[PDB]
Design a protein around this ligand. Structure first.
Ligand code: 7GR
Ligand code: CA
Ligand code: CA
Ligand code: CA
Ligand code: CA
Ligand code: ZN
Length: 316
């Protein structure tokens, strides 16, 4: 909408207060004009017709329970935009400042979130498996990263290419969580998963097998559930990324960590320069090795650690 840029205040899903960029034109809208061509947050009103209505508020204060998922979707989309711009010199998901759209209150009891080809979509959860999923910065950044992938490598959402697609979203979701630096970890979705259970997560990158996901290529899933295991086999790549950053000895193979910033540079370059829609795990290893070579040199520690990490997870 056409209006003037304003700053509202509200509370997110976890009860924390934050300032949000809004737009005033009769109502105050969840429309942040400070980032690219805007960040826009919509109310899906418990229905499945998208996007719903651009979120309107009478007073620029967003403290109602119903407001909380919208506050966090809007705010964390902004943090994710800032990460890509400041860290990778990427302007929104298309590289040309495309408007970022999200809808909250999607459906009823909806235990998921997704990128639908055009926008982000967040369920509220059923209150037992999940609380509203936009409360997780890693989840929000995971979703926006699907848009980045779709505009760049274009990894097809099945089998190995789809597991790479998923891992890319978990990797950058985690790197955005570290960028914001509020309780960061290598777990996925801990802030919104299972409100009745402390200390669990939807996935772990440091130890995928904690939640049943493989941590070695020999343990990959080969069936047809979950688009050929895209959220399962992502554990193999998530573990390799964790090892590149943090180091460790895994199945007897030792990896010297090189830190998060270098992990992010290597995988961002691989995603945007070398991966293709049909890349498999072996091709990802080659892309990551080449990316590290470009950035740091063929004889560098960084290249050596990429190779060790993929060796540790059984990917040649
Ligand atoms: C219990 C769940 C929260 C776990 C998991 N989801 C995630 O980890 C995050 N959502 P996501 O990975 O973005 C879904 N995304 C997904 O299933 O994409 C299918 C699609 C393709 C094209 C258009 C619309 C949807 C899942 O779906 O099993
Ligand atoms: Ca209000
Ligand atoms: Ca965390
Ligand atoms: Ca996390
Ligand atoms: Ca929990
Ligand atoms: Zn995903």
């Amino acid at each position: 909408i056409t209006g003037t840029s304003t700053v509202g205040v509200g509370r997110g899903v976890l009860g924390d207060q934050k300032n949000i960029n809004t737009t005033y034109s009769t109502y105050y809208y969840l429309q942040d004009n400070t980032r690219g061509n805007g960040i826009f947050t919509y109310d899906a009103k418990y229905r499945t017709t998208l996007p719903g209505s651009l979120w309107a508020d009478a007073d620029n204060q967003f403290f109602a329970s119903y407001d909380a998922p919208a506050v966090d979707a809007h705010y964390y989309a902004g943090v994710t935009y800032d990460y890509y711009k400041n860290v990778h010199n990427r302007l929104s998901y298309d590289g040309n400042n495309a408007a970022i759209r999200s809808s909250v209150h999607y459906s009823q009891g909806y235990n998921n979130a997704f990128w639908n080809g055009s926008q982000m979509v967040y369920g509220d959860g059923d209150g037992q498996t999940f609380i509203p999923l936009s409360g997780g910065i890693d989840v929000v950044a995971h979703e926006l990263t699907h848009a980045v992938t779709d505009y760049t490598a274009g990894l097809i959402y099945q089998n190995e290419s789809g597991a790479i697609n998923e891992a890319i979203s978990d990797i950058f979701g985690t790197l955005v969580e570290f960028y914001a630096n509020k309780n960061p970890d290598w777990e996925i979705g801990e802030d919104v998963y299972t409100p009745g259970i402390s200390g669990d997560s939807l996935r772990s990158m440091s130890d995928p097998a904690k939640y049943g996901d493989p941590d070695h290529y020999s343990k990959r899933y080969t069936g047809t559930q979950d688009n050929g295991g895209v959220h399962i086999n992502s554990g193999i790549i998530n573990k390799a990324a964790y090892l590149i950053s943090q180091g460790g000895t895994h199945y007897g193979v030792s990896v010297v960590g090189i830190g998060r910033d270098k992990l992010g540079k290597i995988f961002y370059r691989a995603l945007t320069q070398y991966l293709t829609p049909t890349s498999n795990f072996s091709q990802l290893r080659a892309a990551a090795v080449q990316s590290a070579t470009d950035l740091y040199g063929s004889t560098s520690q960084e290249v050596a650690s990429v190779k060790q990490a993929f060796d540790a997870v059984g990917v040649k």
